[PDB]
Design a binder for this molecule. Structure first.
Ligand SMILES: [Mg+2]
Ligand SMILES: [Mg+2]
Ligand SMILES: [Mg+2]
Ligand SMILES: [Mg+2]
Ligand SMILES: [Mg+2]
Ligand SMILES: [Mg+2]
Ligand SMILES: [Mg+2]
Ligand SMILES: [Mg+2]
Ligand SMILES: [Mg+2]
Ligand SMILES: [Mg+2]
Ligand SMILES: [Mg+2]
Ligand SMILES: [Mg+2]
Ligand SMILES: [Mg+2]
Lengths: 129, 144, 150, 155, 81
RNA sequence: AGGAUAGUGGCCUACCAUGGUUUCAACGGGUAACGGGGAAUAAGGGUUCGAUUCCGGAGAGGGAGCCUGAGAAACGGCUACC
RNA sequence: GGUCGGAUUUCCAACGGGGCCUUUCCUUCUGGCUAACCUUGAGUCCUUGUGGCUCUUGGCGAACCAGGACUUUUACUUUGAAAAAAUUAGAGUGUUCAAAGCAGGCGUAUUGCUCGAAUAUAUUAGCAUGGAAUAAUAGAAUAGGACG
RNA sequence: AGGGGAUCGAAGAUGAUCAGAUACCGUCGUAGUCUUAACCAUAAACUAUGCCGACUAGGGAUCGGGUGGUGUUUUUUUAAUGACCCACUCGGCACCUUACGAGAAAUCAAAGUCUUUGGGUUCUGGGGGGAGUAUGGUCGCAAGGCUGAAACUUAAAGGAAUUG
């Protein structure tokens, strides 16, 4: 049974990106998924995306611009201190100059650069580069 | 996936699984069972003293043909009987019977070395004198 | 799915998107409520009440035309059963299988199916006890089951 | 409560050095000492207006609350004036950066000013040793429903 | 492929796809106003009835259940919606 | 409730109740176990060691008992048994 | 810009914050230091861009003291107090160098002046403390519900 | 243990073959094979591929159900039906091509979405032997099953593929 709709979302996006598709369908599209998409859209890894309002759970159609290398969840969502963010970025990111580890902090879902600017920490959600 | 639990609250399962599968290592099993203390000719020691019981000629393993000139000795501290190889050209005339020898391993923590079958120890000294010194003629074997 | 099978069929009903349907129904929601009540007094379970309503009348979704569900309406009108419908039918199936088994000793397939049915009964009864639909220490005893189902 | 032989013991149960002078008869005719436990906890009206003695009561006894304040759920109400609470917690295992469920059973004295059942949540304050295993007194019952009065049969 | 309008697909394509597998799932059944020669009453029936609905006047039989859509009687007229 | 203690406490006694712990591993067995500060190694995560210079505990051949004393169940104190 | 790629700025770029309004909780009195003043009977001269406006009568005071018309419960994360010394990392210092140690350095030596002996880390749990995304938990269904 | 007991056939007999044949081959034949009531609980019990969920590729078939037809067909030589055809669709046993991907390779539509390593979860392994042995426990009437070491020994054992 489904245990992480975010995991299914990012797997579907990753497979479409690998196969060269310019658009992907995501279901059931929670608001954690929506916040994750907004972060990667802010950084430019995806384009416009559309929430389909069916009366059950919703859907997302994401437009892909071929700039995404890999996106995926970190399950389980480990708690991270301030000083373990550097370790997580070293482990998960290809380089120190680009790519983002997505955190869910009490201040909200943000990327690790924004978290370090805000001096906040939370749980680890996923990555994108 | 991966056939192992991943949840944040599965630490007990992971730790217990690691503990259970740890028993398949050799060194961990020896340490936890205390095999060196219990079942080992030495009491976990590097060296041990013994009294030579007899001189033996051990045939070499294939593809080598030789007589390896070992000694059967009985350890002082526990009375166990072991076979020790006497390493050098000659040096079996230095050993004699009823003499006191000091023994070490070959270097393979058990595990008989080379073409000598079932021999895990070597003679370092006899009658309190180093076998190397007796072979190099630096010293002489005491009468006692 | 198919918690006690390998089947993976979907075979579901797809209710319409429009929660305010169907722009051609003219009967009053109150008249629907009396129809539901009179069927319950006739002795029909909520699922087959909704079936016959949707069939012989234009009422597509009772929860849409009326503001509440069938079981909620019956409970509000004092017609709720002592045990829920799905649990009642699982118990009835178990009684049927047990009656078959008492005479068919060598039906090991029936014994296997009986075990699966009883385990489904116990899981549903546990859910109902936690949600307080059933009283605590309510138990499927397999001795008073025939009494429970009549 | 008021009934069922408050003096059920072989000795007369009373608050020490609290004299109910028989020569002078006031309106209330009896004198009950009590105190506030402090730390924001309030003395219940049951303790204020009760008949029980309970020398171990945090409000009407001789014990005082000082030290740790703990919270837990009730798992046993089988012995007299003592309950067992369960303090569930998660223990961090750094090597796996994960957690494991652990629990402790704390025996705690419950004053008759409180009514507790299995499932209630109570805050307990540390006191001087009361028995072999008990070191805490119930100081507040954070129970609103209890999940007992909504499981009855429906008519 | 490799570039598609997933948001605005073809009506023929959705008519082809499964009822649960469209962009927004919905029923493909419908309701019929049914007239029997016996009287002037109009009976609302379900396409996939799964019962033998009966008319108030012609109170024996109107339709017969089948695997999918109900098999309306030969002596009967009907109208969609 | 009492006794005892410097004092709380089944610490002990009288009476009463039947409780208390446990697969979230009780209870039992093993340890070539004194605990810790710490040590060796070590990309990160870890692995192994810590009788031993500092802290805490325990013991003075093995047990038990006790005197004097603020402080000892002391042993370069006593008493008994082995 | 008399200031030889060398030390800029309320016309601001992007940030990290707090406060207020938008249907927006701070449940509520106790007495007053007269709410970041929604009152100008008076009145304060710096001779024409724009933040240095005096005695302000009260006047609807949450930026404040324990009495209860006072509290759903956590996980998580931030910050802070402590967490012996030695050891570890590390600042200074010509032990002749070094391991070390915590010493030393400078006057005309006429009867003396002076730098030090830093700093960091030391986990889990406990204690305070800001946050309320993520995860759990509870509520009003035979109303035994809320508000006065 | 009762019934049954045609056939075939551990044991056995017997004729061949053979150096020997208490093997293969031939002819018989007890137990078994069948059944009832009880035991046993093991197989290369195999897809040697745990289960649940999501996504990724190009086709032709076929089973079950359902939907639709400028379709046909034995009835009315122009009726439901049933049977075929075409287009779909859901579920299933599977196949064909190729791997973009994976793999040591054989190969694999999963054995893919893995150093760009985290969807959930159970079980098992840690060089070859000793050894599934010894012992303890537990089950069985027994045969035996389940659980299950150590001493010691040893430099390979093993997988896939290449050439001969
Ligand atoms: Mg199942
Ligand atoms: Mg007492
Ligand atoms: Mg007592
Ligand atoms: Mg010891
Ligand atoms: Mg130590
Ligand atoms: Mg001592
Ligand atoms: Mg003295
Ligand atoms: Mg001495
Ligand atoms: Mg001494
Ligand atoms: Mg097979
Ligand atoms: Mg197998
Ligand atoms: Mg099939
Ligand atoms: Mg092995």
């Amino acid at each position: 049974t489904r245990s992480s709709v975010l995991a299914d979302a990012l797997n579907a996006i990753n497979n479409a990106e690998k196969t060269g598709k310019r658009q992907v369908l995501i279901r059931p599209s929670s608001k954690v998924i929506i916040k994750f998409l907004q972060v990667m859209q802010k950084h430019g890894y995806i384009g416009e995306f559309e929430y389909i309002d069916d009366h059950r759970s919703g859907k997302i159609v994401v437009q892909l611009n071929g700039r995404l290398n890999k996106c995926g969840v970190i399950s389980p969502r480990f708690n991270v201190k301030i000083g373990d963010i550097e370790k997580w970025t070293a482990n998960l990111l290809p380089a120190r100059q680009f790519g983002y580890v997505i955190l869910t902090t009490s201040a909200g879902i943000m990327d690790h650069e924004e978290a370090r600017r805000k001096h906040v920490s939370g749980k680890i959600l996923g990555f994108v580069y | 996936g991966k056939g192992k639990p991943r949840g944040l609250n599965s630490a007990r399962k992971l730790r217990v699984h690691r503990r259970n599968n740890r028993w398949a290592e050799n060194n961990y099993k020896k340490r936890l069972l205390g095999t060196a203390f219990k079942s080992s000719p030495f009491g976990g020691s590097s060296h041990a003293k013994g009294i030579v019981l007899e001189k033996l000629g051990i045939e070499s393993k294939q593809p080598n043909s030789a007589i390896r000139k070992c000694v059967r000795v009985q350890l002082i501290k526990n009375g166990k009987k072991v076979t020790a190889f006497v390493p050098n050209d000659g040096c079996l005339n230095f050993v004699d019977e009823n003499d006191e020898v000091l023994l070490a391993g070959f270097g393979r923590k058990g595990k008989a070395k080379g073409d000598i079958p079932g021999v895990r120890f070597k003679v370092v000294k006899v009658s309190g004198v180093s076998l190397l010194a007796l072979w190099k003629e630096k010293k002489e074997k005491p009468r006692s | 799915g198919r918690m006690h099978s390998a089947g993976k069929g979907i075979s579901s009903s797809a209710i319409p998107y429009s929660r305010n349907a169907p722009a051609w129904f003219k009967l009053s929601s109150e008249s629907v409520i009396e129809q539901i009540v009179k069927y319950a007094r006739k002795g029909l379970t909520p699922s087959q009440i909704g079936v016959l309503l949707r069939d012989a009348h234009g009422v597509t979704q009772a929860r849409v035309i009326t503001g509440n569900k069938i079981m909620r309406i019956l409970k509000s009108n004092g017609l709720a059963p002592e045990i829920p419908e799905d649990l009642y039918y699982l118990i009835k199936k178990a009684v049927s299988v047990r009656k078959h088994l008492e005479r068919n000793r060598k039906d090991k397939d029936a014994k296997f199916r009986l075990i699966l049915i009883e385990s489904r009964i116990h899981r549903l009864a546990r859910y109902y006890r936690t949600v307080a639909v059933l009283p605590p220490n309510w138990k499927y005893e397999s001795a008073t089951a025939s009494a429970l189902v009549n | 409560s008021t009934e069922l032989t408050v003096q059920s013991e072989r000795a007369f149960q009373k608050q020490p050095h609290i004299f109910n002078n028989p020569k002078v008869k006031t309106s209330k005719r009896t004198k009950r000492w009590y105190k506030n436990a402090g730390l924001g906890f309030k003395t219940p009206k049951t303790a204020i207006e009760g008949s029980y003695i309970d020398k171990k009561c945090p409000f009407t006894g001789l014990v005082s609350i000082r030290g740790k304040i703990l919270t837990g759920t009730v798992v046993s109400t089988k012995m007299h004036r003592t309950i067992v609470i369960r303090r569930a917690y998660l223990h961090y295992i750094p090597k796996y950066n994960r957690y494991e469920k652990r629990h402790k059973n704390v025996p705690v004295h419950v004053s008759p000013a409180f009514r507790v059942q299995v499932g209630d949540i109570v805050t307990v304050g540390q006191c001087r040793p009361i028995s072999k295993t008990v070191r805490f007194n119930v100081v507040k019952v954070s129970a609103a429903a209890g999940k007992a009065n909504k499981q009855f049969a429906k008519f | 492929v490799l570039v598609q309008d997933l948001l605005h697909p073809t009506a023929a394509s959705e008519a082809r796809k499964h009822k649960l597998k469209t962009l927004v799932q919905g029923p493909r059944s419908y309701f019929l106003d049914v007239k029997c020669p016996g009287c002037l009453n109009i009976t609302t029936v379900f396409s996939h009835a799964q019962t033998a609905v009966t008319c108030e006047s012609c109170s024996t039989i109107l339709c017969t259940p089948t695997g999918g859509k109900a098999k309306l009687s030969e002596g009967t007229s009907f109208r969609r919606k």
